[PDB]
Amino acid sequence: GMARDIQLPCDGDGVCMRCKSNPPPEESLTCGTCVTPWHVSCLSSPPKTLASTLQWHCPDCS
Amino acid sequence: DIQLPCDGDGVCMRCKSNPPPEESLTCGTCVTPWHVSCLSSPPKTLASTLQWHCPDC
Ligand SMILES: [Zn+2]
Ligand SMILES: [Zn+2]
Ligand SMILES: [Zn+2]
Ligand SMILES: [Zn+2]
């Protein structure tokens, strides 16, 4: 997990607000509550189990 | 050898159940849902889970 300070979501156009990159699908995670895309690389605690990755809840919703 | 996906309604064609989101995995190429519980080899990394290719792909 990259972010040691505050974590930022994605653009809505698909750009990570933190690292200024457009994450590929293998690096993208959308929340199960607000459905906001997040760059999984720039998270503080990326999901570590398969179930946590499926029903993933973003840091703003957790 | 007999890996079966989910129907349009959602009932898994290998266990006759409607899996929850914590047990549903949609393929990144043919956008077909699958029941991970009925999968022979579930994904092993985070990248293979985020962009998942179903057995038939
Ligand atoms: Zn990023
Ligand atoms: Zn959320
Ligand atoms: Zn099943
Ligand atoms: Zn497929």
Curated annotation (Swiss-Prot), chain A:
Compartments, as annotated in UniProt: Nucleus
Segments forming PHD-type zinc fingers: 13-62
Summary of the knockout phenotype: Centromere DNA hypomethylation and centromeric heterochromatin decondensation in interphase. Decreased DNA methylation primarily at CpG sites in genic regions, as well as repeated sequences in heterochromatic regions. Released transcriptional silencing at heterochromatin regions. Ectopic CpHpH methylation in the 5S rRNA genes against a background of CpG hypomethylation.
Expression by tissue: Mostly expressed in inflorescence and, to a lower extent, in leaves.
More details: ORTH2 is missing in cv. Bor-4 that exhibit a centromere repeat hypomethylation phenotype.
Quaternary state and interactors: Interacts with histones CENH3, HTB2, HTR3 and H4.
Domain notes: The RING fingers are required for ubiquitin ligase activity. The YDG domain mediates the interaction with histone H3.
Stated role: E3 ubiquitin-protein ligase. Participates in CpG methylation-dependent transcriptional regulation and epigenetic transcriptional silencing. Mediates ubiquitination with the E2 ubiquitin-conjugating enzyme UBC11. Promotes methylation-mediated gene silencing leading, for example, to early flowering. Associates with methylated DNA, and can bind to CpG, CpNpG, and CpNpN DNA motifs, with a strong preference for methylated forms, and with highest affinity for CpG substrate. Probably acts at the DNA methylation?histone interface to maintain centromeric heterochromatin.
Protein name: E3 ubiquitin-protein ligase ORTHRUS 2
Biological source species: Arabidopsis thaliana (Mouse-ear cress)
Residues of the full protein shown: 1 to 61 of 645
